[PDB]
Every structure is written in C-alpha cells, then in structure tokens.
A paper describes a structure:
Originally discovered in a proteomics screen, the Ska complex is now recognized as a key element required for maintaining stable KT–MT attachments. The ternary Ska complex, composed of Ska1, Ska2 and Ska3, localizes to the outer KT in a KMN-dependent manner. Although GST–Ska1133–255 is not strictly equivalent to the FL Ska1 dimer in the native complex, and thus might bind MTs differently, it clearly interacted with MTs more efficiently than Ska1133–255. These observations suggest that Ska1133–255 (from now on referred to as MTBD) is the major MT-binding element within the Ska complex, which, on dimerization, can bind MTs more efficiently. Here we have used biochemical and high-resolution structural analysis to show that the human Ska complex interacts with MTs through the C-terminal domain of Ska1, which forms a variant form of winged-helix domain.
To understand the structural basis for the ability of human Ska complex to bind MTs, we obtained crystals of the Ska1–MTBD in two different crystal forms that diffracted X-rays to about 2 Å. Models from crystal form I (space group C2221) and II (space group P32) were refined to 2.1 and 2.3 Å with R factors of 19.6 and 22.5, and Rfree factors of 25.1 and 26.8, respectively, and superpose well with an overall root mean square deviation of 0.6 Å. The structural analysis showed that the Ska1–MTBD is related to a winged-helix domain, a domain known for its ability to bind DNA and in mediating protein–protein interactions. The Ska1–MTBD differs from the canonical winged-helix domain by the incorporation of two additional modules. Analysis of the electrostatic surface potential revealed the existence of contiguous positively charged patches all over the Ska1–MTBD surface, suggesting the potential involvement of multiple MT contact sites. Although mutations at K170/177 and K135/203/206 showed no major effects on MT binding, mutations at R155/236/245, a region reported recently to be critical for MT binding, together with two new regions identified in this study, K183/184/203/206 and K217/223/226/227, all showed significant reductions in MT binding (Kd=20±4.5, 17.1±5.5 and 14.5±2.8 μM, respectively, versus WT=2.9±0.6 μM), pointing to the existence of multiple MT interaction sites. Confirming this notion, a combination of R236/245A with R155A resulted in stronger reduction in MT binding than R236/245A alone, and the simultaneous mutation of multiple clusters (K183/184/203/206/217/223/226/227/R236/245A) almost completely abolished MT binding. These results provide clear evidence that the human Ska complex binds MTs through a multipartite binding mode of Ska1–MTBD.
Author numbering: 2 to 124
Amino acid sequence: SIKEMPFITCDEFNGVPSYMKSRLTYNQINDVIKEINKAVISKYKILHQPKKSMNSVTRNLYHRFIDEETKDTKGRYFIVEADIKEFTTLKADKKFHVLLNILRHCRRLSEVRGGGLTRYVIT
C-alpha cells in the first residue's frame, strides 16, 4: 500500500506559472514522477522486508533508511537525494530541482529538513 505521487494533468500543468515551466515539457515532469515513484517503492519494499531475508547490501540501505526517520516522518512516505541516485538513473541537477519545485507547487511533495538533510515527503 505504498504511497505514489499521481501524474500531473493537462489542466494542472497549464495552471502552473510560466517561469516554472521553462524548458520542462509536460511528459518530462510525468516521466520524472514515474522515477520518483520507483524510488519510493524500492525504498519502502526494503523497509517492509523481513529482516532475516535481508542480504548485506539491503541491510545497509535499511540502516540508512532508519537513520533518516524523524518524528515528523512517522507513518509518512519520503525519499532523499541518495535514494534518487540509488534506485534511478535520474541526474540530480539544476533541471531536477526546478522539476521538484513544480512538484511542490502542484502539492505532490513537501520538504522536511533537520539533521542537515532534506527529505521529500510524498503528498
């Protein structure tokens, strides 16, 4: 029952301010949403995995996921930049943070900081 980010619609996309849209095409934003969802699912499948079934690489990820929990993330779904790198071939560059800003505007994610870490909380 892992939480996924819904695709942006025609109406929604036409309604985000022009300067944000910039270079970014409509399929571009939705393609990125697919990849972010892939990372969310990958992370949370590991979290829900029986610990005795974990190999060394999975346990190391599991440990990092636990290190990144806070009281503000309890019962919520989030990823960080390392997850994008771990589970996707998405480049976390300038265009990517521009993309993230459209996602925040369309209320698909928000940010939980602290511990010097930016967490992207789904929804």
